[PDB]
Amino acid sequence: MINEIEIKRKFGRTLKKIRTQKGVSQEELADLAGLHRTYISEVERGDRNISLINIHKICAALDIPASTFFRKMEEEN
Amino acid sequence: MINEIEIKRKFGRTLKKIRTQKGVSQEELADLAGLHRTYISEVERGDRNISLINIHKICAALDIPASTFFRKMEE
């Protein structure tokens, strides 16, 4: 059975980890991706229905391929 | 920075390619992923901005990791 909350929260945990590893603040990431900082923060908590376009804007801003983002998500405990 | 129409169209083309490679019709993918056929068709055409949840469902239905799906999309 699909757990929408866990899927979203796992995405957000992975974003926070990658962003923080890269030394980028939420505000910086928001600016680079053309998104609101409140929205970045919400995504990091799994509050948003993040979709393909914003996934790619965020990954582009962090200079990481989406495949690598999802591989890290998949490798999480 | 990304071009949004290109991303949506490239995802849709990649989905059609993987599904067809695996011998799965749009109707069967809808059945397996718990989505409507029309939605699958729209996604394949690049007319939707597919959600993380539905990416997950489609990839699971096709027995492909999302990372691998996106690696193919990135080719």
A 45-74 → B contacts, CB under 8 A = 49-53, 55-57, 60, 65-68, 70-71, 73-74
Cα A11 to Cα A69: distance, rounded to the nearest angstrom: 9
Residue B56, both tokens: 């997950």
8 Å CB contact between A40 and B44 = no
- Domain containing B49 — which CATH number? 1.10.260.40
Our count of domains for chain B comes to: 1
Amino acid at B67: S
Contact B11, A13 (CB under 8 A): no
* H-state helical runs in A1-77: 4-21, 26-33, 37-44, 52-61, 66-75
The residue written with tokens 């809808």 in the block is B30
Output A24-32 pairs: Cβ under 8 A, ≥24 positions apart. A24/A61, A24/A62, A29/A58, A29/A61, A29/A62, A32/A61, A32/A62
Which one of B55, B57, B71 has the shortest CB-CB distance to A52? B55
d(CA B60, CA B32): 9
Angle at A18 between CA A44 and CA A55, to 5 degrees: 60
SS3 B51: strand
Helix (H, G, I), strand (E, B) or coil at A18: helix
Which of A15, A42, A47, A52 to mutate to test binding with chain B, by most B CBs within 10 Å of its CB? A52
Experimental method, per PDB record: X-ray
Cα distance from A30 to chain B (closest Cα, Å)?
A: 12
User: Resolution in A, one decimal?
Assistant: 1.5
Residue A26: exposure state from Cβ atoms within 10 A (0-12, 13-18, ≥19): buried
Q: What domain range is A54 assigned to?
A: 1-77
